Design an enzyme around this catalytic site. Structure first.
Site, PDB file in Angstrom:
ATOM      1  N   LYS A 251       0.043  -5.548   5.682  1.00 48.69           N
ATOM      2  CA  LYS A 251      -0.118  -6.348   4.476  1.00 48.69           C
ATOM      3  C   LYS A 251       0.582  -5.730   3.294  1.00 48.69           C
ATOM      4  CE  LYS A 251      -4.078  -5.901   1.528  1.00 48.69           C
ATOM      5  NZ  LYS A 251      -3.912  -4.436   1.628  1.00 48.69           N
ATOM      6  N   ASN A 252       0.500  -4.419   3.159  1.00 51.01           N
ATOM      7  CA  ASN A 252       1.191  -3.709   2.081  1.00 51.01           C
ATOM      8  C   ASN A 252       2.709  -3.782   2.207  1.00 51.01           C
ATOM      9  OD1 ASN A 252      -1.270  -3.025   1.013  1.00 51.01           O
ATOM     10  ND2 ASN A 252      -1.371  -1.000   1.969  1.00 51.01           N
TER      11      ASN A 252
ATOM     12  N   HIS B 254      -7.735  -2.374  12.196  1.00 48.33           N
ATOM     13  CA  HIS B 254      -7.999  -2.296  10.722  1.00 48.33           C
ATOM     14  C   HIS B 254      -6.855  -1.547  10.017  1.00 48.33           C
ATOM     15  CE1 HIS B 254     -11.970  -3.781  11.401  1.00 48.33           C
ATOM     16  NE2 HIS B 254     -12.545  -2.623  11.674  1.00 48.33           N
TER      17      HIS B 254
ATOM     18  N   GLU C 296      -3.884  -3.236   7.395  1.00 52.88           N
ATOM     19  CA  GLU C 296      -3.772  -2.892   5.973  1.00 52.88           C
ATOM     20  C   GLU C 296      -2.339  -2.447   5.654  1.00 52.88           C
ATOM     21  OE1 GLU C 296      -5.813  -2.961   3.441  1.00 52.88           O
ATOM     22  OE2 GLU C 296      -4.603  -1.691   2.014  1.00 52.88           O
TER      23      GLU C 296
HETATM   24  C1  LIG Z   1      -2.091  -0.916  -2.280  1.00 53.99           C
HETATM   25  C2  LIG Z   1      -1.838  -2.370  -2.052  1.00 53.99           C
HETATM   26  C3  LIG Z   1      -2.916  -3.187  -1.802  1.00 53.99           C
HETATM   27  N1  LIG Z   1      -2.711  -4.462  -1.605  1.00 53.99           N
HETATM   28  C4  LIG Z   1      -1.497  -5.005  -1.629  1.00 53.99           C
HETATM   29 CL1  LIG Z   1      -1.305  -6.687  -1.329  1.00 53.99          CL
HETATM   30  N2  LIG Z   1      -0.435  -4.216  -1.859  1.00 53.99           N
HETATM   31  C5  LIG Z   1      -0.562  -2.908  -2.091  1.00 53.99           C
HETATM   32  C6  LIG Z   1       0.579  -2.142  -2.291  1.00 53.99           C
HETATM   33  C7  LIG Z   1       0.671  -1.129  -3.207  1.00 53.99           C
HETATM   34  C8  LIG Z   1       1.841  -0.410  -3.313  1.00 53.99           C
HETATM   35  C9  LIG Z   1       2.916  -0.678  -2.506  1.00 53.99           C
HETATM   36  N3  LIG Z   1       4.038  -0.029  -2.600  1.00 53.99           N
HETATM   37  C10 LIG Z   1       4.677  -0.044  -3.877  1.00 53.99           C
HETATM   38  C11 LIG Z   1       5.239  -1.370  -4.199  1.00 53.99           C
HETATM   39  C12 LIG Z   1       6.481  -1.668  -3.718  1.00 53.99           C
HETATM   40  C13 LIG Z   1       7.052  -2.870  -3.992  1.00 53.99           C
HETATM   41  C14 LIG Z   1       6.366  -3.759  -4.754  1.00 53.99           C
HETATM   42  C15 LIG Z   1       7.022  -5.069  -5.061  1.00 53.99           C
HETATM   43  N4  LIG Z   1       7.691  -4.887  -6.328  1.00 53.99           N
HETATM   44  C16 LIG Z   1       6.619  -4.800  -7.294  1.00 53.99           C
HETATM   45  C17 LIG Z   1       7.337  -4.976  -8.602  1.00 53.99           C
HETATM   46  C18 LIG Z   1       8.475  -5.897  -8.238  1.00 53.99           C
HETATM   47  C19 LIG Z   1       8.358  -6.091  -6.746  1.00 53.99           C
HETATM   48  C20 LIG Z   1       5.114  -3.460  -5.244  1.00 53.99           C
HETATM   49  C21 LIG Z   1       4.538  -2.250  -4.969  1.00 53.99           C
HETATM   50  C22 LIG Z   1       4.606   0.582  -1.593  1.00 53.99           C
HETATM   51  O1  LIG Z   1       5.662   1.145  -1.672  1.00 53.99           O
HETATM   52  C23 LIG Z   1       3.828   0.675  -0.327  1.00 53.99           C
HETATM   53  C24 LIG Z   1       2.598   1.280  -0.393  1.00 53.99           C
HETATM   54  C25 LIG Z   1       1.815   1.408   0.716  1.00 53.99           C
HETATM   55  C26 LIG Z   1       2.290   0.958   1.902  1.00 53.99           C
HETATM   56  O2  LIG Z   1       1.543   1.087   2.959  1.00 53.99           O
HETATM   57  C27 LIG Z   1       3.523   0.374   1.991  1.00 53.99           C
HETATM   58  C28 LIG Z   1       4.297   0.239   0.875  1.00 53.99           C
HETATM   59  O3  LIG Z   1       5.479  -0.317   0.957  1.00 53.99           O
HETATM   60  C29 LIG Z   1       2.825  -1.701  -1.604  1.00 53.99           C
HETATM   61  C30 LIG Z   1       1.662  -2.403  -1.484  1.00 53.99           C
END
Ligand SMILES: Cc1cnc(Cl)nc1-c1ccc(N(Cc2ccc(CN3CCCC3)cc2)C(=O)c2ccc(O)cc2O)cc1
Ligand SMILES: CC(C)c1ccc(COc2ccc(CC(=O)NCCN)cc2Cl)cc1
Ligand SMILES: [Cl-]
Ligand SMILES: [Cl-]
EC number: 2.7.11.2
Length: 343
Positions: free
Chosen positions: A233-234, A226, A230
């Site tokens: 995917k982030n 799990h 997660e």
């Molecule tokens: C929380 C969450 C849930 N569901 C999904 Cl689908 N996405 C997230 C998520 C939230 C935050 C992040 N951001 C910020 C981010 C970086 C880059 C972009 C792309 N840009 C965005 C503007 C232009 C391209 C968007 C956002 C992280 O930095 C990040 C956070 C947690 C993480 O574990 C890893 C990470 O890289 C990554 C993922």
């Protein structure tokens, strides 16, 4: 009825956290009678401690439908387990109907996550999203969810074993890197579906004391999956969306390190990061609730799974470059004890 009397009686007891050893010993394995006599006491205690905390929420949260509904599941569930207290452990039919009863209780609570999320929502629109409301929602739901993880753990261990390698949901010889690849593979499959580009994976092990041995541990691999899911995917979304106008797509790099006490899993990405000020909100139930995003348990719940056996899950980012996410787990089975909310 007797629910307020029951809650009150059983909340006088403290929950008894178990360790991996206690868990393994329950599972090797004829001591069904013993798991039963344990659980018919311990479940009411855990139910009642959390039920007591729910009943102390202010009346404007407590009277909303979502909370009423889950309060009625808890009441019913506790009542289901009461029936067995005067019953006879030697009667093999007592044992079989108790298992049936655990499964029915598991099914009954399956949808709490979306149910609570409607409550957070209703509260946001109905009373606001000020910082003080946020801390209270945080405090309550971290405890409610930790408590819930712990009960499912008890229940899954009983129903899986009392229906030779795996002990219910514990793997005494979990190969961490294997769980990493499986979760990567699955997140890649979804990433390729919705984005038609996906980063690669690099795994590196560091086994401090045994330089070359593959890294194994005693753990619950579904939990580890799990959390890894997660995170992947982030990192994928960050990496892919941040490199749309560019050709290079950086890999996601994971290091699995084994120390004397920590077993640490870092996932490093080059997705552009988050500024420091915005990091805490990623763990906030309230700020991450609104009426690839569809999959996963979420950050706040993945951190609870980590905390649950005395670990943690932390994020640190460099705005403009990317983010490390680290899962901290206890290396030794002897330091892996249930972390239960303090009532
Ligand atoms: C929380 C969450 C849930 N569901 C999904 Cl689908 N996405 C997230 C998520 C939230 C935050 C992040 N951001 C910020 C981010 C970086 C880059 C972009 C792309 N840009 C965005 C503007 C232009 C391209 C968007 C956002 C992280 O930095 C990040 C956070 C947690 C993480 O574990 C890893 C990470 O890289 C990554 C993922
Ligand atoms: C998870 C769902 C059900 C949910 C939704 C909302 C809440 C919010 O709970 C709050 C909100 C504000 C305050 C401060 C205050 O003014 N307290 C005074 C108490 N009367 C205390 C609490 Cl316990 C919890 C849980
Ligand atoms: Cl906690
Ligand atoms: Cl953090």
């Amino acid at each position: 009825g007797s629910a307020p009397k029951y809650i009150e009686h059983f909340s006088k007891f403290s929950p008894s956290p178990l360790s991996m050893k206690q868990f393994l010993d329950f599972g090797s394995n004829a001591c069904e009678k013993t798991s039963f006599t344990f659980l018919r006491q311990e479940l009411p205690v855990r139910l009642a401690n959390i039920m007591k905390e729910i009943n102390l929420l202010p009346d404007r949260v407590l009277s909303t439908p979502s909370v009423q509904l889950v309060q009625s599941w808890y009441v019913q569930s506790l009542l289901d387990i009461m029936e067995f207290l005067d019953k006879d452990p030697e009667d093999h039919r007592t044992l079989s109907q108790f298992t049936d009863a655990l499964v029915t209780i598991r099914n009954r609570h399956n949808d709490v996550v979306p149910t609570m999320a409607q409550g957070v929502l209703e509260y946001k629109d109905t009373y606001g999203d000020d910082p003080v409301s946020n801390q209270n929602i945080q405090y309550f739901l971290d405890r409610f969810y930790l408590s819930r993880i712990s009960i499912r753990m008890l229940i899954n261990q009983h129903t899986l074993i009392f229906d030779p390698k795996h002990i219910g949901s514990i793997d005494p010889n979990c190969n961490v890197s294997e769980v990493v690849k499986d979760a990567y593979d699955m997140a890649k499959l979804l990433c390729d579906k919705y984005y038609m580009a996906s980063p690669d994976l690099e795994i590196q092990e560091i086994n401090a004391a045994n330089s070359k041995q593959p890294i194994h541990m005693v753990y619950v691999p579904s939990h580890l999956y799990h959390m890894l899911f997660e995170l992947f995917k982030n990192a994928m979304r960050a990496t892919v969306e941040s490199h749309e106008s560019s050709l290079i797509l950086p890999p996601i790099k994971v290091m699995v390190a084994l120390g004397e006490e920590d077993l640490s899993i870092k996932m490093s990405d080059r997705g552009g990061g988050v500024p420091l000020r915005k990091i805490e909100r990623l763990f906030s139930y309230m700020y991450s609730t609104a009426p690839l995003a569809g999959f996963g348990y979420g950050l706040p719940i993945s951190r609870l799974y980590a905390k649950y056996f005395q670990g943690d899950l932390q994020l640190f980012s460099m705005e403009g470059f990317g983010t490390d996410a680290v899962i901290y787990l206890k290396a030794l089975s002897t330091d892996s004890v249930e972390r239960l909310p303090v009532y």
